[PDB]
C-alpha cells in the first residue's frame, strides 16, 4: 500500500549543494509516532544511515557527515527533504528514503533510491548500435540479439525491449567506465530463431540525464 | 558510537539449506535489532524488527534470535529467490549504525555458458570506431575467462568485462565482453574471435567471424 520515491538532480558538481526529495503515499508523517529516514549507499559499499525527521519535527544526524546535513518536512506535501552541503566524489551514492513508526526505527518501507554522481564532467548523450543476429546463431534453436549503448554520462541510462514487452531473456549489463571518462554498456535478449523473422525486435534508450532516446531495430 | 559486524561478507549456499547469518555489537543493544533484505534493482525490505518479530508479508523461514551483543538471522530452507545482501541494524543509541552487509548467493548446479560474437555495426564504423561484443550466456559459477584473438594473436588491454548479478528465474549469470579498436585497426584484420574457459565446458569454446 505504502509507496516512497526519491528525487534528484542526478549529477552535482563538488563543492555544491545537493538537494534531494522523499515523495510519499499510503501513510501521514503528522501521525503520532511516524518517522522518515535518509540513508545512501555508495557503489559497492554497504548502508549508511544519513538523517532522520519524526512528526513532531526533531531533527537526528549522523556525525560523520558533520555540519553538511539539513533534513526538513512538508507533511501538506507528503514531503521530506534533505540537503547536503559542499559535496565531493565521496558524496556519490545511491540515496534512500524509509519510514517508520515509534522509537526505536524499523524501517518498514524503504523507496527505491536515487543515483547521485559527484563530477566536474558534462553531461553527454549515446550512440545506440544494434547487436544484430548471427546467420548461423542455431538454425530451429536460439539466436541472440541486442544493443550497445556507448560513449554516455553520468549514469544511469534506461533501456527496455518492445517497450517493455519483452522481458523473458533479457540481460542489461552494468555500465563499464571507458578509458574517455564516458560509460558504455550492451543490452542483449535471446529469442527463438524461427521467430528472427517474423516478430519485430527493437530495443528503447532513454538517458534521461541529456535526454537523448533512442529506439533502435534490430534485424538479421 | 555503537560499531556492528557481519562475520560473513559473502556466501553460497544451495536450496533447501539453513543458513545461519551473524550480527555483532560492539555493546549492548538491548534487543533493538532489525534485519534487511537487499536484492538486487529492487527497494530494500524488512525482514525481522526486535531480534525476533516478523515483518508482515515475510514467510516463516525466515527468524532472528540473540541478546546482547550477539545476533543471528535464520533461513530454515533457503529459496532460489532468496539471494539478496543481508543487512542488520542497531536502534540502541544515535547514531543508527548497520552491518557491513552479508552477500548470500544461490548454489546451483553448474551451467556452461552459451556463448555469441557481435562483429561492430555498419552504424559504428561510420564514426572511426569498432566494439567486437561477446555474450557469455547463463553459466553457474560466476568465473568465467574470456580471451580475444585477432588474427590468432591474443589480445591485451584493449577489452572490458560486465558481469550481470544472479538472475531471479535460473540462479544464472551473464557476462559481457567489449573488444575496442579503431577502425583502421580494425580493418587490418580478418579473423576476430572470444575464446571462453568456464567450469561446464569440457574444452575452451571458440566463437569467430571473418569481416568480409
Known amino acids: 500500500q505504502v509507496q516512497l520515491q526519491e528525487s534528484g538532480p542526478g549529477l552535482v558538481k563538488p563543492s555544491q549543494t545537493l538537494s534531494l526529495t522523499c515523495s510519499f503515499s499510503?501513510?501521514?508523517?503528522?501521525?503520532?509516532?511516524?518517522?522518515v529516514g535518509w540513508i545512501r549507499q555508495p557503489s559497492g559499499k554497504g548502508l549508511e544511515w544519513l538523517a532522520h525527521?519524526?512528526?513532531?519535527?526533531?531533527?537526528s544526524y549522523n556525525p560523520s557527515l558533520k555540519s553538511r546535513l539539513t533534513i526538513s518536512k512538508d507533511t501538506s506535501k507528503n514531503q521530506v527533504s534533505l540537503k547536503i552541503t559542499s559535496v565531493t566524489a565521496a558524496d556519490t551514492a545511491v540515496y534512500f528514503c524509509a519510514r517508520n513508526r515509534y522509537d526505536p526505527p524499523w524501517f518498514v518501507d524503504w523507496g527505491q533510491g536515487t543515483l547521485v554522481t559527484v563530477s566536474s564532467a558534462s553531461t553527454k548523450g549515446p550512440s545506440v548500435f544494434p547487436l544484430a543476429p548471427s546467420s548461423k546463431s542455431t538454425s530451429g534453436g536460439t539466436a541472440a540479439l541486442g544493443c550497445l549503448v556507448k560513449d554516455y554520462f553520468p549514469e544511469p541510462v534506461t533501456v527496455s525491449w518492445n517497450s517493455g514487452a519483452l522481458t523473458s531473456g533479457v540481460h542489461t549489463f552494468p555500465a563499464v567506465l571507458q578509458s574517455s571518462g564516458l560509460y558504455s554498456l550492451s543490452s542483449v535478449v535471446t529469442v527463438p530463431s524461427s521467430s528472427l523473422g517474423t516478430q519485430t525486435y527493437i530495443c528503447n534508450v532513454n538517458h534521461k540525464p541529456s535526454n537523448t532516446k533512442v529506439d533502435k531495430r534490430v534485424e538479421p | 558510537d555503537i560499531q556492528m559486524t557481519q562475520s560473513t561478507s559473502s556466501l553460497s549456499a544451495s536450496v533447501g539449506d539453513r543458513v545461519t547469518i551473524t550480527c555483532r555489537a560492539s555493546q549492548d543493544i538491548s534487543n533493538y535489532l532489525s534485519w534487511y533484505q537487499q536484492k538486487p534493482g529492487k527497494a530494500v525490505k524488512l525482514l525481522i524488527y526486535?531480534?525476533?518479530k516478523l515483518h508482515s508479508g515475510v514467510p516463516s523461514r525466515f527468524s532472528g534470535s540473540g541478546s546482547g551483543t550477539d545476533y543471528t538471522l535464520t533461513i530454515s530452507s533457503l529459496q532460489q529467490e532468496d539471494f539478496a545482501t543481508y543487512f542488520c541494524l542497531q536502534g540502541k543509541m544515535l547514531p543508527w549504525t548497520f552491518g557491513q552487509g552479508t552477500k548470500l548467493e544461490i548454489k546451483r548446479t553448474v551451467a556452461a555458458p552459451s556463448v555469441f560474437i557481435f562483429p561492430p555495426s555498419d552504424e559504428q564504423l561510420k564514426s572511426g570506431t569498432a566494439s567486437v561484443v561477446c555474450l557469455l550466456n547463463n553459466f553457474y559459477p560466476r568465473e568465467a575467462k574470456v580471451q580475444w584473438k585477432v588474427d590468432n594473436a591474443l589480445q591485451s588491454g584493449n577489452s572490458q568485462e560486465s558481469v550481470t548479478e544472479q538472475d531471479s528465474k535460473d540462479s544464472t549469470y551473464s557476462l559481457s565482453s567489449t573488444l575496442t579498436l579503431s577502425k583502421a585497426d580494425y580493418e587490418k584484420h580478418k579473423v576476430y574471435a572470444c575464446e571462453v574457459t568456464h567450469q561446464g565446458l569440457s574444452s575452451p569454446v571458440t566463437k569467430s567471424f571473418n569481416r568480409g
Open positions: 525527521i519524526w512528526w513532531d519535527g526533531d531533527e
Open positions: 526486535y531480534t525476533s
Open positions: 499510503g501513510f501521514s508523517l503528522s501521525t503520532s509516532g511516524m518517522g
